[PDB]
Structure formats: C-alpha cells, structure tokens
Amino acid sequence: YGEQPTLTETSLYRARRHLFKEERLKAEQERLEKIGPMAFYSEWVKAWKGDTSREAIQKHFEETGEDENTQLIEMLSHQTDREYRIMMGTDIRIRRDPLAMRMREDQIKEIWGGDPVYPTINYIQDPDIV
Amino acid sequence: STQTLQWKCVESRTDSKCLHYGRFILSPLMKGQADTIGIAMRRALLGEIEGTCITRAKSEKIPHEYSTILGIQESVHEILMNLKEIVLRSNLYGTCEASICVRGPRGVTAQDIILPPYVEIVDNTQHIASLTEPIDLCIGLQLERNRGYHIKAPNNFQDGSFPIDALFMPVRNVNHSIHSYGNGNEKQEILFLEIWTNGSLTPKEALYEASRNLIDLLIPFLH
Amino acid sequence: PPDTDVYAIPKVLAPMPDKYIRCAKTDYGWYNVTEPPIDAPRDPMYKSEREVSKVFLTKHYRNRRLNDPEFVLDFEEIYVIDSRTKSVTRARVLVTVPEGRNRDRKGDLLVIRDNGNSFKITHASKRDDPTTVIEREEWTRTRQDMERHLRKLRDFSISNWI
Amino acid sequence: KDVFMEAKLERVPFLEEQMRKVNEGGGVMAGDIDRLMKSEDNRFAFVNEIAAEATAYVNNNRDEYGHKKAIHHVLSNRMNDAGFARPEAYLETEPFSPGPTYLKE
Amino acid sequence: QDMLIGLYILTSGNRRGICANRYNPWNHKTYQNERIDDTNYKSMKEPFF
C-alpha cells in the first residue's frame, strides 16, 4: 500500500510465505533450462572468465572432443572452498530460496534491527588466555 | 576369518499369481556392516529395477476422459485405471505398439493385448473392461520401461492419447532387520531382508538385480 | 409421512404436465456417517443412512425409449420434490450455450448448485474438473475468514495483498 | 444379492511381517490367555485352578521343569485341545544362532 | 507427547484454501480455450491411485 509493510500485510505474508517461495524456486529452476548448467553454475565460480553460454559451448565441442560435460567440470575446478560452500545452497534437497542467498547486507541487518547499542567488544574474550 | 560371506533363504512363498514374498539371511558380519548393507540394498530395491508398463492409450472417438461409451460398464477413466495395474515381464528398451480390436458383448482380459514376443503377460485373470453391446472398440496402447525414480512429463496431445502415468514398480515393499550375537569376545551379526514383488520378477532375481545395479554405480570410483 | 398409511395430496407450486411423460428419477443425499455407541463386543463402529432431500425428475427428449440409439435427456423441464416442506416445483434451468434454442441435444452438461436451487446448462466440453470445484469453494470461503480475521487490526484500511 | 461379498473379504497382503513381532513379544500368549478366560466367571478361580494344575505337573514329572515353565505347559495343554497348535510350553528357539546369546536390543 | 505429535503430524491434511493457491481458481483463463476441445491436455490435477 505504501512504503513500509503494515501489521496486516506482514501477518498475511506469514500465512502465504510458501506460495511465494515456491514461485521463486520455480523461476530459479526454469532459469536453468534456458541458461544451461554451464552458465548457471558460474555466478559462484569466480575467476573463470569464459563464455558461459550454450552457443560457443557447441563451438568448443566442435573444436575439441570435450562436450558440455567436461567444460563444466573444468570450470568447477577453480572454485575455492568458500565459493563452493556458498554455492551448496542450490542443492536439490536443501532448497534455499533465491531471495535469501542474494539479499544485501543492509536487508539482512534489518532482521534484528541493526547493530546492538551496547558494543559486543565488551563481551568478546580470547579462548587462549589466562 | 572363518565362515566367509554368503546368503541363504529360508522363507520363499508365492501366495497368488501376482504376489511374491521372500526373506533372506546373510553371513557373519562385523559390527556396523549390517546397517549399511541393509540401507543400501533397501534403497536399491525400492527403485532401481526397470519396470515395464503401459504409458499411453489411444481411444478412438473419445474427446475427454469423462466420456464413458455405451456398452462398456467401465468409464474411460476406469478403462485407464484397469490398464494401469497390468503386469508385464520384459527386457525392452524404449517403447512399442499394441492394440485392442475386438467386438463381442463379453468380458475382456489381458490376453487381448497384442504384444511383441519380448513382452509377456504375467497374469491371465486380470480384467480390463466389461462389454455388453456388439460394438467395436480400439485402444492403441504404448508400453515403456524406465527405472525406479523416473519422472516423465505429459506429451503427445495431438492424437488424443490419454496418459496412464504409472509407477514402474516390480517391487511393493522392502523390510530390513538386523540381529546380533556375542560369544563373549566377538560381536557377530546377521542381516534379514524381506522382499515383496509384483510378479514379473521372482523375488530372488531382485536380490541379484538390486545388487548388480548398485555395484555398477560403485565401480567407476576405481576407474 | 415415511411409511404411513395416512394419505394427503401434496402442495403444488407450479403447473404440472397433463400427459404421459417419460422422465428419469434422481436424488440428493448426504450419507450421514454418525458414530454410534459401543455396548457389546463386535458392535458397529459407524452408522450410515441416505438422507435424500430432493428428487429431481428430468423429462426425456420427446419421450424416447431407454435403449433406442437416440437417448437424450430433455433438461428444459425438471420437477423438484422437496422433503423439508412437502411440495413439487418446476425447475428454472438456465442455458448459457451460444446456440440458444437451436442446438445439438447430444450433450449439454447441466450444473446444479447450492441446496438444489441454481440450475445451469453448459456445453459438455467445458466441464469443470473435480479438483477445481472443490478448490473454488475452499478459496472463496477461506478468503472471507482471513479478511474477517484481519478486519480487527488497526491498519486494515491501509493494507493490500489478497 | 447384497453387493459386499468380496469387498469386505479381500485378503489384506503384506501381513507376513505383522505375524512375527506378535510371536517374540509374547502377543500369542497374551491373546490366548484372554480367549481361555473368555468363558470363566471368576478370574481368581481360573488362576487358582491353573496354579493347582501346574503344581500337579511339577509333582508328577519333577525332573523336567526349570526350563519348560510348567504354567506355560498347562496353558499350552489347555489351548491345544481345540485346535490352536501352540507349540509345547510356548518354547522359543533360535533358528539362526551360531552364537550363545542374542543382544536383546 | 512424542507419539501424539507424530500421529497429529501424520493426520494433518493438506493446505485447504488460500494457503495452497496464490491466485483465485475462478480466474477465467488456462482453459486451453478455443472452439474445439482439441488443445494441449496436461491437467496435472491429483494422482488417481
């Protein structure tokens, strides 16, 4: 209705969460068909400045015997641990909604309402001190 | 060291033409082997075996499933329902064709299904429809054979074929249990497997097939 | 009254035919499944009896036969036998088919609705699926309850989303 | 005439596993005790009669009981005279045991 | 407690109304509409076991 959600819109989305989540997941899965696995699994694989499109993949398969399965494996070989761990959210049975794993830091900070007023540095100790 | 691994069956009973029950005991297994074996073999048995069944049916002069024809006591939806639980034994890859072209105010059974020699009917007492009028009926079947967990989308809407989306189960229930024994210094264990089966597969051939299809998957790690 | 020898003519709320009409007999029942008490072992765990409350009578198309290869119900004339208040009424069926008066009678799907009151005739191609009808009333009846529940909130006037 | 002849008589399959867990859980004895007590008026008299019969069994053939649990013997004897096979003394075996003791969960 | 929760979750049913569909099913559309009933026929509906 306006700029901020009202106390009735929130209590209605609380009832209808799963429908929107299913729509988001369906759109994300439908993206795989058009995009193809090669380009889809390249957002999380940084430091691979390739083509990532099922138009030059066929050209590469015509140039060399590698098909659209060994180029994918080759890209998934410079992934680094952290990028793979983050990419694991697209697992077929974990099913993290695409909106959750792409929200900015500002939006996530609003879940609990910004930083605490009392600094946390007063609580933090070091586990290896006497 | 002693008493190398082997399997032995004590109970193996065929109740009806399309029911098959078996139970199997393994050999001395160390601690923890029985759980892993039971879980893996149950996961393989539930769905890994290719099952041959109908997938489509081409009814002539019927534009919708709720269009039951005079002379047949079963509606078109009921005709598909009957042509969903038929049991076939085969080693096919892909598909084939079939037909039902008879005209008699009498009962119809599985024998009416024209089949190539590599697909054989399992039972002969299964009912399809109940004809009571001298009318000609034509239903062009289409067999298929996939794996256990196969998901297929509807297609071929041009000719008015009615999807008969099926289970591709030769199995019907699997139940694994473990036993253990201690001679005071050795925790020898035992596995028990219980297998039901549709009928197109003896429930001992399941033991061989669901183990071969798992070894086939585990082998490429040695490549 | 049910299974009684005392007779009495019913209440007529509409003109009735004065000729011989070949029609079909219908019913409108609920199948109450109340669970009776258990007194002795092996006593039944449930009950069941039909509660027919409306017997519609649909005329045949020009009074044809039962087995002749021209069987069509004449949905224009339907007579309702009530049970709550003993009376016979003629239906007021409605036709939305664009063909109107001139049409093929070999299939014109008839839709009845709440408490045997509404009556519509539609082409047999556009028949509603069993799931769609169930989901339709569930969606409508639960959208009112959600709106009624949310009406008591202070921000109901400035809101959105259903 | 009544069309429910076979709809209420179709055999329930998959019952083989729900035939065993009755037999090691003591379910057969529990379901036999009540059927034996289905006609008795006073249960205490039935229990006393069973105890006296078991005492007689122990007295006449002493050098057999200690394993057979003569109360189980008399219960099996009473259940075995009207069909109801009920193996002797409700004795349990270990068909598959190349070992001395089961773990028993 | 635990068995009761298991049985309650088992016999809890589907999502009845607006919690199962985002949009109204009245929604005159998706009829595969034309002058004849010869169109694409998916009709996912529900299984017919």
XYZ file of C-alpha atoms in Angstrom:
669
model
C 0.000 0.000 0.000
C 2.785 2.431 0.882
C 6.487 2.390 1.756
C 6.678 0.100 4.798
C 4.745 -3.143 5.349
C 1.765 -2.813 7.660
C 0.935 -5.096 10.571
C -1.762 -6.792 8.468
C 0.334 -7.343 5.336
C 3.047 -8.990 7.438
C 0.524 -11.250 9.186
C -0.855 -12.256 5.762
C 2.509 -12.963 4.163
C 3.192 -15.041 7.274
C 0.262 -17.191 6.138
C 1.215 -17.260 2.437
C 5.035 -17.475 2.638
C 5.362 -20.876 0.988
C 3.490 -19.870 -2.175
C 5.887 -17.014 -2.929
C 8.858 -19.200 -2.011
C 7.655 -21.891 -4.424
C 7.208 -19.302 -7.175
C 10.771 -18.065 -6.620
C 12.167 -21.604 -6.648
C 10.200 -22.472 -9.791
C 11.575 -19.395 -11.556
C 15.116 -20.280 -10.467
C 14.740 -23.828 -11.790
C 13.204 -22.553 -15.038
C 16.266 -20.336 -15.486
C 18.445 -23.463 -15.667
C 16.665 -24.758 -18.773
C 17.261 -21.659 -20.901
C 20.635 -20.689 -19.422
C 22.118 -24.179 -19.196
C 24.147 -25.663 -16.341
C 27.428 -24.236 -17.645
C 26.466 -20.570 -17.316
C 24.107 -21.082 -14.365
C 26.886 -22.585 -12.235
C 29.263 -19.713 -12.962
C 27.975 -16.977 -10.638
C 29.516 -18.819 -7.689
C 32.634 -19.841 -9.656
C 34.579 -16.602 -9.835
C 37.931 -16.276 -11.617
C 36.682 -18.138 -14.703
C 36.451 -15.554 -17.493
C 34.980 -17.852 -20.117
C 31.956 -17.664 -22.398
C 29.255 -19.408 -20.312
C 26.593 -19.779 -22.997
C 25.244 -22.783 -24.886
C 26.235 -21.222 -28.240
C 30.039 -21.224 -28.007
C 29.976 -24.444 -25.976
C 28.929 -26.224 -29.167
C 31.743 -24.422 -30.991
C 34.243 -25.706 -28.421
C 32.793 -29.216 -28.734
C 33.333 -28.941 -32.491
C 36.912 -27.731 -31.978
C 37.782 -30.343 -29.334
C 36.216 -33.612 -28.219
C 35.174 -32.159 -24.856
C 31.377 -31.984 -24.680
C 29.081 -29.924 -22.466
C 30.174 -32.036 -19.501
C 33.984 -31.674 -19.366
C 33.962 -27.892 -19.787
C 31.612 -27.758 -16.802
C 33.968 -29.996 -14.810
C 36.929 -27.837 -15.838
C 35.228 -24.668 -14.614
C 34.259 -26.466 -11.407
C 37.967 -26.873 -10.642
C 38.997 -23.316 -9.644
C 36.041 -22.854 -7.317
C 37.820 -22.279 -3.961
C 36.309 -23.679 -0.763
C 34.216 -20.674 0.281
C 32.571 -20.250 -3.120
C 31.621 -23.935 -3.223
C 30.245 -23.772 0.318
C 28.074 -20.803 -0.645
C 27.048 -22.457 -3.929
C 25.865 -25.527 -1.998
C 22.685 -23.550 -1.233
C 21.378 -24.520 -4.683
C 21.320 -28.169 -3.577
C 18.385 -30.240 -4.792
C 17.325 -31.089 -1.222
C 18.437 -28.037 0.778
C 16.368 -25.630 -1.337
C 17.345 -22.188 -0.114
C 15.012 -19.661 -1.700
C 16.894 -17.437 -4.181
C 15.897 -14.249 -2.355
C 17.607 -15.370 0.860
C 21.069 -16.129 -0.556
C 21.161 -12.878 -2.555
C 19.925 -10.299 -0.029
C 22.286 -7.413 0.622
C 23.930 -6.899 3.999
C 21.625 -3.938 4.657
C 18.485 -6.045 4.237
C 19.814 -8.867 6.425
C 20.798 -6.396 9.152
C 17.131 -5.369 9.402
C 16.074 -8.817 10.658
C 17.273 -7.990 14.176
C 17.330 -4.221 13.645
C 20.893 -3.060 13.115
C 23.896 -3.238 15.385
C 23.429 -3.513 19.164
C 23.665 -0.248 21.066
C 25.902 -1.844 23.699
C 29.104 -2.859 21.864
C 29.799 -6.576 21.589
C 33.533 -5.971 22.095
C 32.803 -5.838 25.834
C 31.700 -9.495 25.786
C 34.283 -10.991 23.424
C 37.189 -12.803 25.081
C 40.057 -14.866 23.682
C 39.815 -18.656 24.214
C 43.581 -18.945 24.870
C 44.188 -16.543 27.755
C 44.903 -16.988 31.442
C 38.368 -65.114 9.137
C 36.246 -68.264 9.117
C 32.763 -68.601 7.594
C 33.180 -66.397 4.537
C 30.247 -64.294 3.381
C 27.190 -65.962 1.854
C 23.415 -65.546 1.722
C 20.734 -68.139 2.451
C 16.951 -68.025 2.043
C 14.619 -69.774 4.482
C 11.178 -68.363 3.560
C 10.156 -68.029 -0.090
C 6.408 -68.212 -0.686
C 4.318 -67.335 -3.736
C 0.825 -66.541 -2.469
C -1.047 -65.617 -5.663
C -0.179 -65.186 -9.333
C 0.909 -61.576 -8.701
C 2.272 -61.871 -5.162
C 5.753 -62.994 -4.147
C 7.328 -62.988 -0.683
C 10.916 -63.769 0.253
C 13.212 -63.487 3.252
C 16.997 -63.798 3.237
C 19.759 -64.175 5.840
C 23.359 -63.041 5.421
C 26.588 -64.453 6.882
C 28.689 -63.453 9.930
C 29.086 -59.685 9.565
C 31.185 -57.456 11.800
C 29.735 -54.636 13.882
C 28.136 -51.927 11.756
C 28.199 -53.770 8.425
C 24.575 -54.901 8.662
C 23.111 -51.400 8.947
C 24.979 -50.054 5.919
C 24.191 -53.130 3.821
C 20.507 -53.068 4.722
C 20.165 -49.357 3.981
C 21.988 -49.535 0.644
C 20.162 -52.664 -0.526
C 16.770 -51.279 0.519
C 17.443 -48.010 -1.315
C 18.427 -50.010 -4.399
C 15.478 -52.417 -4.168
C 12.838 -49.704 -3.729
C 13.638 -48.095 -7.032
C 16.469 -49.293 -9.229
C 14.908 -52.076 -11.330
C 13.474 -51.171 -14.720
C 9.738 -51.784 -14.819
C 7.743 -52.382 -17.999
C 4.226 -50.941 -18.091
C 1.837 -49.047 -20.334
C 2.113 -45.271 -20.512
C -0.495 -44.134 -23.053
C -3.739 -45.252 -24.669
C -5.292 -44.028 -27.923
C -9.078 -44.246 -27.621
C -10.974 -43.578 -30.846
C -13.967 -41.200 -30.887
C -13.488 -40.122 -27.250
C -12.579 -36.440 -26.690
C -12.373 -36.476 -22.884
C -11.776 -38.954 -20.078
C -15.310 -38.491 -18.686
C -16.953 -39.774 -21.876
C -17.954 -43.333 -20.991
C -19.301 -45.200 -24.018
C -22.476 -47.261 -24.103
C -21.883 -50.999 -23.912
C -18.887 -50.686 -21.564
C -19.701 -50.835 -17.855
C -16.407 -49.065 -17.040
C -15.868 -45.400 -17.848
C -12.912 -44.310 -19.978
C -11.183 -43.227 -16.775
C -11.966 -46.699 -15.423
C -10.586 -48.266 -18.617
C -7.298 -46.457 -17.965
C -7.473 -47.425 -14.282
C -7.760 -51.077 -15.313
C -4.970 -50.594 -17.860
C -2.716 -49.230 -15.130
C -2.108 -52.275 -12.895
C -1.358 -54.825 -15.636
C 1.881 -56.739 -15.027
C 4.349 -57.369 -17.861
C 7.740 -59.095 -17.931
C 10.268 -57.908 -20.496
C 13.784 -56.727 -21.323
C 12.715 -53.907 -23.641
C 14.455 -50.593 -24.307
C 12.197 -47.716 -25.282
C 8.668 -48.423 -26.475
C 6.453 -50.494 -28.766
C 2.864 -50.568 -30.026
C -0.223 -52.585 -29.135
C -3.930 -52.678 -29.919
C -7.281 -53.948 -28.657
C -9.553 -54.610 -31.660
C -12.410 -56.973 -30.751
C -16.204 -56.858 -30.968
C -18.148 -59.068 -28.558
C -20.660 -58.468 -25.737
C -18.410 -60.357 -23.323
C -15.562 -59.901 -20.883
C -12.094 -58.728 -21.879
C -8.860 -59.862 -20.242
C -5.114 -59.287 -20.591
C -4.871 -61.778 -23.479
C -6.467 -59.170 -25.757
C -3.271 -57.073 -25.579
C -1.318 -57.735 -28.775
C 2.325 -57.831 -27.737
C 5.707 -58.418 -29.375
C 7.370 -61.642 -28.184
C 9.770 -59.858 -25.795
C 6.901 -58.564 -23.610
C 4.957 -61.320 -21.847
C 1.871 -61.052 -19.660
C 2.289 -62.139 -16.043
C -1.331 -62.914 -15.112
C -4.265 -64.077 -17.211
C -7.156 -63.385 -14.807
C -6.868 -59.583 -14.899
C -9.930 -57.715 -16.157
C -9.899 -54.718 -18.490
C -13.477 -53.818 -19.426
C -16.994 -55.270 -19.458
C -18.524 -55.256 -22.938
C -22.276 -55.778 -23.213
C -23.039 -54.357 -26.686
C -21.996 -55.519 -30.166
C -19.711 -52.510 -30.629
C -16.156 -52.189 -31.916
C -13.554 -50.699 -29.576
C -9.998 -49.642 -30.411
C -7.374 -48.623 -27.845
C -3.812 -48.304 -29.108
C -1.571 -48.977 -26.126
C 2.060 -47.896 -25.794
C 4.412 -49.796 -23.497
C 7.540 -48.375 -21.886
C 10.298 -49.420 -19.492
C 12.114 -46.977 -17.192
C 13.974 -47.132 -13.887
C 12.625 -46.748 -10.354
C 12.623 -42.991 -9.722
C 11.755 -41.786 -13.215
C 9.747 -38.576 -13.647
C 8.073 -38.099 -17.031
C 6.125 -35.117 -18.386
C 2.883 -35.438 -20.377
C 3.310 -35.215 -24.145
C 1.709 -36.215 -27.460
C -1.611 -34.401 -27.079
C -2.252 -34.284 -30.838
C -3.910 -37.685 -31.331
C -5.972 -37.560 -28.138
C -3.887 -40.110 -26.248
C -4.699 -40.364 -22.540
C -1.691 -40.538 -20.188
C -1.777 -43.556 -17.877
C 1.197 -42.375 -15.789
C 2.307 -45.402 -13.787
C 4.703 -46.431 -11.015
C 7.182 -48.754 -12.784
C 7.247 -50.903 -9.631
C 8.226 -54.540 -9.783
C 8.627 -54.269 -6.006
C 5.886 -53.498 -3.482
C 7.590 -53.386 -0.054
C 11.057 -53.975 1.398
C 11.790 -54.578 5.084
C 15.306 -54.917 6.504
C 16.240 -56.015 10.021
C 19.420 -56.886 11.894
C 20.363 -59.434 14.540
C 23.490 -59.614 16.657
C 25.227 -62.205 18.807
C 28.134 -62.123 21.228
C 30.303 -65.124 22.086
C 31.937 -63.069 24.848
C 34.646 -61.590 22.615
C 33.118 -61.315 19.112
C 30.048 -59.341 18.025
C 28.942 -61.443 15.077
C 25.869 -60.012 13.345
C 23.250 -61.129 10.828
C 21.084 -59.378 8.231
C 17.455 -60.138 7.362
C 15.860 -58.905 4.140
C 12.158 -59.189 3.291
C 11.061 -58.535 -0.289
C 7.636 -58.407 -1.900
C 7.390 -58.287 -5.674
C 4.818 -57.650 -8.393
C 5.122 -60.965 -10.222
C 7.096 -60.144 -13.365
C 10.235 -60.865 -11.324
C 10.917 -63.723 -8.931
C 11.793 -62.187 -5.532
C 15.246 -63.746 -5.689
C 16.109 -62.176 -9.020
C 15.527 -58.909 -7.156
C 18.417 -59.794 -4.843
C 20.730 -60.210 -7.839
C 19.471 -57.216 -9.830
C 19.411 -54.666 -6.993
C 22.985 -55.661 -6.114
C 24.294 -55.587 -9.683
C 22.714 -52.166 -10.271
C 24.477 -50.834 -7.151
C 27.850 -52.398 -7.966
C 27.560 -50.794 -11.407
C 27.306 -47.389 -9.724
C 30.076 -48.048 -7.192
C 32.574 -49.408 -9.753
C 33.540 -46.157 -11.587
C 35.296 -44.936 -8.423
C 38.094 -47.393 -9.275
C 38.451 -46.060 -12.835
C -45.022 -39.358 6.415
C -42.317 -42.030 5.994
C -44.029 -45.437 5.843
C -47.506 -44.343 6.915
C -50.946 -45.204 5.552
C -52.383 -41.703 6.095
C -52.538 -40.102 2.647
C -52.780 -36.460 1.606
C -52.296 -34.598 -1.671
C -49.086 -32.516 -1.766
C -48.617 -28.794 -2.343
C -48.295 -27.706 -5.977
C -46.191 -24.584 -6.562
C -46.060 -24.694 -10.380
C -48.022 -26.145 -13.310
C -47.543 -29.876 -13.852
C -47.923 -31.941 -17.039
C -51.311 -33.336 -18.029
C -49.931 -36.049 -20.340
C -47.728 -39.152 -20.152
C -44.096 -38.049 -19.805
C -41.164 -40.469 -19.792
C -38.717 -38.991 -17.281
C -35.858 -40.051 -15.006
C -35.673 -40.172 -11.209
C -32.797 -38.522 -9.330
C -31.955 -37.866 -5.679
C -29.981 -35.515 -3.417
C -28.479 -37.322 -0.430
C -25.801 -36.812 2.226
C -24.907 -40.243 3.714
C -24.748 -39.360 7.400
C -21.881 -41.318 8.989
C -22.512 -40.662 12.693
C -20.663 -42.962 15.095
C -22.976 -44.838 17.488
C -22.057 -46.001 20.999
C -20.472 -49.398 21.610
C -22.323 -51.616 24.098
C -21.065 -55.171 23.500
C -18.037 -56.547 21.618
C -18.326 -56.536 17.810
C -20.821 -53.662 17.890
C -20.586 -51.461 14.774
C -18.124 -48.576 14.908
C -20.070 -46.351 12.490
C -23.521 -45.801 11.002
C -24.730 -44.893 7.521
C -28.087 -43.987 6.002
C -29.078 -41.906 2.995
C -30.843 -38.592 3.609
C -32.446 -37.914 0.227
C -33.838 -34.380 0.345
C -34.676 -33.542 -3.290
C -35.851 -35.775 -6.141
C -35.463 -34.031 -9.491
C -37.342 -35.564 -12.428
C -35.862 -34.852 -15.864
C -38.035 -35.390 -18.932
C -36.765 -37.409 -21.875
C -36.232 -35.698 -25.225
C -39.729 -36.034 -26.729
C -40.233 -39.187 -24.617
C -37.902 -41.575 -26.433
C -37.072 -45.118 -25.300
C -34.413 -46.399 -22.861
C -32.436 -48.480 -25.386
C -33.053 -46.673 -28.688
C -29.881 -45.100 -30.192
C -31.201 -41.559 -29.690
C -31.115 -41.258 -25.887
C -31.033 -37.626 -24.739
C -32.376 -36.102 -21.536
C -34.611 -33.063 -22.023
C -33.086 -30.752 -19.418
C -35.561 -27.930 -20.096
C -38.267 -29.477 -17.880
C -37.206 -30.638 -14.405
C -39.514 -31.045 -11.397
C -38.225 -30.798 -7.823
C -39.699 -32.869 -4.984
C -38.716 -31.275 -1.685
C -38.652 -33.144 1.621
C -38.300 -30.432 4.263
C -41.590 -28.879 3.082
C -43.616 -31.377 1.041
C -44.106 -29.688 -2.338
C -43.399 -30.154 -6.046
C -41.871 -27.342 -8.101
C -40.728 -26.996 -11.699
C -37.079 -26.063 -12.114
C -35.875 -22.824 -13.711
C -32.872 -24.180 -15.627
C -30.686 -21.659 -17.462
C -28.793 -22.075 -20.739
C -25.583 -20.139 -21.414
C -24.801 -22.029 -24.642
C -24.488 -19.526 -27.535
C -26.504 -21.839 -29.804
C -29.612 -20.994 -27.783
C -32.851 -22.648 -28.851
C -31.349 -24.326 -31.936
C -28.593 -26.671 -30.765
C -27.480 -30.284 -30.562
C -29.052 -32.031 -27.577
C -26.493 -34.880 -27.712
C -24.550 -33.461 -24.788
C -25.329 -30.233 -22.908
C -23.812 -30.569 -19.448
C -26.148 -29.486 -16.644
C -24.782 -27.945 -13.444
C -26.700 -27.973 -10.177
C -25.557 -25.964 -7.175
C -26.309 -24.968 -3.570
C -29.207 -26.869 -1.984
C -30.747 -27.744 -5.350
C -31.634 -24.155 -6.262
C -29.336 -22.980 -9.063
C -29.643 -24.680 -12.450
C -27.448 -24.059 -15.496
C -26.783 -25.852 -18.783
C -23.342 -25.682 -20.392
C -21.621 -27.340 -23.336
C -20.116 -30.677 -22.327
C -16.627 -29.612 -23.452
C -16.301 -27.007 -20.679
C -16.946 -29.347 -17.747
C -15.159 -28.407 -14.540
C -12.584 -30.746 -13.039
C -13.399 -32.389 -9.682
C -10.451 -30.655 -8.017
C -11.261 -27.209 -9.424
C -14.783 -27.170 -7.962
C -13.515 -28.213 -4.523
C -10.660 -25.704 -4.644
C -13.038 -22.967 -5.825
C -15.298 -23.003 -2.760
C -12.338 -23.507 -0.425
C -10.621 -20.422 -1.845
C -13.759 -18.273 -1.641
C -14.884 -19.398 1.816
C -11.426 -19.046 3.388
C -10.700 -15.646 1.834
C -13.693 -14.247 3.722
C -12.487 -15.750 7.007
C -8.996 -14.313 6.526
C -10.442 -10.891 5.697
C -12.822 -11.113 8.663
C -9.951 -12.054 10.982
C -7.743 -9.224 9.695
C -10.548 -6.640 9.876
C -9.970 -6.072 13.600
C -6.405 -4.811 13.100
C -5.820 -1.064 13.271
C -4.100 -0.995 9.853
C -6.812 -2.833 7.907
C -7.815 0.299 5.984
C -4.238 0.833 4.749
C -3.364 -2.683 3.579
C -3.141 -4.901 0.498
C -2.356 -8.396 -0.696
C -5.202 -10.848 -1.221
C -27.883 -60.056 -3.589
C -26.029 -57.808 -1.140
C -23.040 -56.457 -3.092
C -20.394 -56.505 -0.396
C -19.471 -60.207 -0.595
C -15.811 -59.760 -1.553
C -15.184 -56.061 -0.873
C -15.252 -56.940 2.838
C -13.391 -60.226 2.253
C -10.375 -59.231 0.138
C -7.281 -60.612 1.842
C -5.011 -57.935 3.301
C -1.491 -58.591 1.958
C 1.910 -57.656 3.447
C 0.832 -59.331 6.700
C 3.853 -61.640 6.981
C 5.905 -59.103 8.932
C 2.835 -58.416 11.089
C 2.794 -62.067 12.085
C 6.247 -62.336 13.688
C 6.502 -59.358 16.066
C 3.489 -60.898 17.810
C 5.440 -64.110 18.440
C 8.551 -62.805 20.249
C 6.686 -60.055 22.089
C 4.533 -62.555 23.951
C 1.486 -61.484 21.966
C 0.324 -65.027 21.248
C 0.258 -65.936 24.947
C -1.488 -62.669 25.833
C -4.132 -63.234 23.161
C -4.565 -66.845 24.242
C -4.987 -66.080 27.953
C -7.999 -63.847 27.318
C -9.587 -66.407 24.991
C -9.186 -69.024 27.726
C -10.705 -66.536 30.191
C -13.499 -65.573 27.775
C -15.875 -68.098 29.384
C -14.725 -68.053 33.022
C -16.946 -66.243 35.515
C -14.437 -65.536 38.310
C -10.848 -64.996 37.189
C -9.398 -65.840 40.612
C -10.854 -69.354 40.456
C -9.363 -69.800 36.980
C -5.951 -68.646 38.224
C -6.115 -70.974 41.236
C -7.095 -73.913 39.021
C -4.170 -73.164 36.698
C -1.788 -72.959 39.662
C -3.018 -76.262 41.111
C -2.712 -77.996 37.733
C 0.833 -76.647 37.369
C 1.678 -77.878 40.879
C 0.424 -81.343 39.923
C 2.506 -81.183 36.731
C 5.617 -80.329 38.747
C 4.929 -83.138 41.218
C 4.273 -85.965 38.762
C 7.231 -85.368 36.384
C 9.648 -83.327 38.527
C 12.886 -83.796 36.623
C 11.779 -81.861 33.523
C 10.762 -78.405 34.771
C 13.068 -75.462 35.361
C 13.142 -74.566 31.673
C 9.674 -75.558 30.497
C 7.829 -73.277 32.974
C 5.027 -75.726 33.770
C 2.493 -72.883 33.917
C 3.229 -72.333 30.233
C 2.919 -76.112 29.846
C -0.603 -76.256 31.285
C -1.651 -73.162 29.333
C -0.423 -74.773 26.104
C -2.157 -78.037 27.031
C -5.468 -76.232 27.538
C -5.050 -74.254 24.319
C -4.057 -77.325 22.274
C -7.303 -79.291 22.766
C -9.384 -77.053 20.462
C -7.010 -76.618 17.547
C -4.633 -73.707 18.188
C -1.355 -75.559 17.638
C 0.585 -73.587 20.288
C 3.967 -75.414 20.463
C 4.768 -77.246 23.686
C 5.221 -74.986 26.734
C 5.415 -71.997 24.345
C 9.098 -72.812 23.983
C 11.191 -70.358 21.966
C 14.080 -71.416 19.737
C 16.979 -69.669 17.989
C 16.853 -70.963 14.399
C 19.739 -68.728 13.248
C 22.260 -68.560 16.098
C 25.856 -69.680 15.654
C 26.383 -67.947 18.982
C 25.403 -68.318 22.635
C 23.361 -65.179 23.337
C 21.295 -62.591 21.499
C 21.878 -58.944 22.383
C 18.157 -58.334 23.095
C 18.131 -54.692 21.984
C 3.690 -36.402 23.821
C 6.052 -37.689 21.123
C 3.762 -40.359 19.661
C 0.863 -37.906 19.869
C 2.818 -35.303 17.890
C 3.779 -37.935 15.331
C 0.169 -39.010 14.850
C -1.046 -35.401 14.695
C 1.518 -34.515 12.024
C 0.579 -37.674 10.120
C -3.136 -36.797 10.195
C -2.834 -33.077 9.493
C -4.108 -32.872 5.909
C -3.142 -30.575 3.067
C -3.424 -26.778 2.844
C -7.116 -26.053 2.313
C -7.638 -22.663 0.701
C -5.610 -19.507 0.111
C -2.619 -21.243 1.710
C -2.416 -23.595 -1.299
C -3.077 -21.175 -4.184
C -1.766 -17.641 -4.584
C -4.483 -16.627 -7.064
C -8.188 -17.376 -7.170
C -9.145 -20.529 -9.123
C -12.151 -18.736 -10.653
C -9.724 -16.785 -12.858
C -11.338 -17.435 -16.239
C -8.213 -18.450 -18.175
C -5.945 -21.509 -18.733
C -8.975 -23.261 -20.273
C -6.888 -24.230 -23.319
C -9.629 -22.171 -24.873
C -10.721 -22.460 -28.499
C -13.824 -23.552 -30.401
C -12.942 -27.264 -30.001
C -11.592 -29.431 -27.171
C -8.503 -30.399 -29.228
C -5.738 -28.496 -27.439
C -2.875 -29.194 -25.045
C -4.084 -31.520 -22.274
C -1.839 -31.584 -19.208
C -4.403 -31.443 -16.366
C -1.955 -32.133 -13.547
C -4.886 -32.434 -11.093
C -4.028 -35.059 -8.421
C -2.910 -38.700 -8.626
C -5.560 -41.383 -9.032
C -4.061 -44.258 -7.043
